[PDB]
């Protein structure tokens, strides 16, 4: 198989809305995510979530809940990318743009599906009715997925 390398993803899910990243700078700039990036040495997985939360966001939290974890593999790439997902309805602070990252508030009804990476539509859905998944997806580039598994799983 690929090396992997670990990276995080936290989606900040409440009743009515969730709040994106607009990544604002370079190639793959206009592309609304969720907040993460590597988990660094010796932390856990979780901590490594919530530190890149608060550089990238400014926003703090108590703890996570962990909902899925996605492989990615791109063309011409040897490394995977193995992601690990976590939510949290409970924040207690603002939102900061910074000059790499927007945060903006999205109502649950839009979803701004087509400014995120592909593989989200197959997965936010089953974040967003509480269910815990495993993926993997395969990319041309930025745009294009050749193969993808996804699966609800009962515990992550
Ligand atoms: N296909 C995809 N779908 C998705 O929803 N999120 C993806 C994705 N591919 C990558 N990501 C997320 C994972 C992680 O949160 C982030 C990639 O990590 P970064 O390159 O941002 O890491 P770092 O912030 O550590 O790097 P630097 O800021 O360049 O030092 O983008
Ligand atoms: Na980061
Ligand atoms: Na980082
Ligand atoms: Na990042």
Same mark, same amino acid.
């Given at each position: 198989?690929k090396?992997?390398?670990?990276?995080?993803?936290?989606?900040?899910?409440?009743?009515?809305?969730? #709040?994106?990243?607009?990544?604002?700078?370079?190639?793959?700039?206009?592309?609304?995510?969720?907040?993460?990036?590597?988990?660094?040495?010796?932390?856990?997985?979780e901590?490594?979530?919530?530190?890149?939360?608060? $550089?990238?966001?400014?926003?703090?939290? !108590?703890? #996570?809940?962990?909902?899925?974890?996605?492989?990615?593999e791109?063309?011409?790439?040897?490394?995977?990318?193995?992601?690990?997902?976590?939510?949290?309805?409970?924040?207690?602070?603002?939102p900061?743009?910074?000059? $790499?990252?927007?945060?903006?508030?999205?109502?649950?009804?839009?979803?701004?599906?087509?400014?995120?990476?592909?593989?989200?539509?197959?997965?936010?859905?089953?974040?967003?009715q509480?269910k815990?998944?495993?993926?993997?997806?395969?990319?041309?580039?930025? !745009?294009?997925?050749?193969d993808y598994?996804?699966? $609800?799983?009962?515990?992550?």
């Amino acid at each position: 198989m690929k090396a992997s390398r670990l990276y995080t993803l936290v989606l900040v899910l409440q009743p009515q809305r969730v #709040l994106l990243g607009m990544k604002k700078r370079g190639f793959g700039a206009g592309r609304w995510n969720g907040f993460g990036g590597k988990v660094q040495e010796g932390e856990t997985i979780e901590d490594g979530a919530r530190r890149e939360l608060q $550089e990238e966001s400014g926003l703090t939290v !108590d703890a #996570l809940h962990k909902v899925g974890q996605i492989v990615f593999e791109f063309v011409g790439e040897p490394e995977l990318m193995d992601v690990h997902v976590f939510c949290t309805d409970s924040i207690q602070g603002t939102p900061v743009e910074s000059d $790499e990252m927007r945060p903006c508030w999205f109502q649950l009804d839009q979803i701004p599906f087509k400014d995120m990476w592909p593989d989200d539509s197959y997965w936010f859905p089953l974040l967003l009715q509480k269910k815990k998944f495993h993926g993997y997806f395969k990319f041309q580039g930025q !745009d294009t997925i050749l193969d993808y598994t996804l699966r $609800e799983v009962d515990t992550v």
